[PDB]
């Protein structure tokens, strides 16, 4: 299984999560690509991958507003070629705000709708990967059993 990990991150918190996930999924024996949303193109992005792990921060309090680099890709999710592919979502957020890790349910709902198989419940963490290393590790463990 060739995994793509796609992240949108403004201060580096979801990026640290993406990086820890790359390390752990690769360690499990998978070919893994790390891609920042800033340099990604939605059109047929999932071609050649068996699983896509996507995640980003939310920025709109009362409304859901996704991370700037990720939001155009989210809007063009229909073009990625996700039908039949496995998917899991992750996010860094802050519980003081409304829509805590709101990108996770939003990506899961949109992905299901396009024929992707969402492999497990998305990771929701406050702060960066070293603030909650065990939740990151358990989620990676969940994806590895499903790949």
Residue of the chain from 5, 6, 92, 110 that contacts ligand FMN (CB under 6 A) = 92
145 Cβ contact partners less than 8 Å away, ≥ 6 residues apart: none
Return the range that interacts with ligand FMN (CB under 6 A); candidates 27-35, 36-44, 54-62, 106-114: 54-62
Q: Quick check: 58 binds ligand FMN (CB under 6 A)?
A: yes
By C-alpha distance, which of 10, 1, 19, 11 is closest to 90? 19
The owner of tokens 């705000």 is 97
Residue of the chain from 47, 78, 98, 121 that contacts ligand FMN (CB under 6 A) = 98
C-alpha dist (Å) from residue 78 to 1, 82, 84, 134 = 22, 8, 13, 33
Residue showing the smallest CB distance to ligand FMN in the complex: 93
> Which residues contribute to the site for ligand FMN (CB under 6 A)?
9-15, 57-61, 67, 92-94, 97-102
């Amino acid at each position: 299984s060739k995994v793509l990990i796609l992240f949108g991150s403004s201060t580096g918190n979801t990026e640290s999560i993406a990086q820890k996930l790359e390390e752990l999924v690769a360690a499990g024996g998978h070919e893994v690509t790390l891609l920042n949303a800033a340099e990604a193109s939605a059109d047929n992005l999932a071609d050649g991958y068996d699983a896509v792990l996507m995640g980003c921060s939310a920025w709109g309090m009362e409304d859901l507003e996704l991370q700037d680099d990720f939001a155009p890709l989210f809007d063009e999710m229909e073009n990625m070629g996700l039908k039949g592919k496995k998917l899991a979502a992750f996010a860094s957020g802050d519980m003081e705000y409304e829509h805590y890790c709101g990108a996770v349910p939003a990506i899961e709902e949109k992905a299901r709708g396009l024929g992707a198989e969402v492999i497990c419940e998305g990771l929701k963490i406050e702060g960066d990967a070293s603030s909650d290393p065990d939740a990151v590790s358990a989620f990676a463990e969940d994806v590895l059993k499903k790949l």
